[PDB]
Amino acid sequence: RYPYYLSDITDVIFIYFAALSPAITFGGLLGEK
After folding, report:
1. CA 15 to chain centre
2. Residue 27, by phi and psi: left (phi above 0), alpha (psi -120 to 50) or beta?
3. DSSP structure class, residue 20
4. Whole-number Å distance between alpha carbons of 31 and 7
5. Is 17 helix (H, G, I), strand (E, B) or coil?
6. How far is it, in rounded angstroms, from Cα 3 to Cα 33?
7. Each residue of 8-30: b (16+ CB within 10 Å) or e?
8. How far, in Å, CA of 9 to CA of 16, rounded?
9. Residue 14: in which H helix or E strand, if any?
């Protein structure tokens, strides 16, 4: 009865860590955030 909890949750973590993954590596020398 809780489908949206397993699929829609993993998808939210797929693009949340994917997008911020690179943006964190590149740059980040002078300004931290």
Report:
1. 5
2. left
3. H
4. 35
5. helix
6. 35
7. eeeeeeeeeeeeeeeeeeeeeee
8. 11
9. helix 7-25
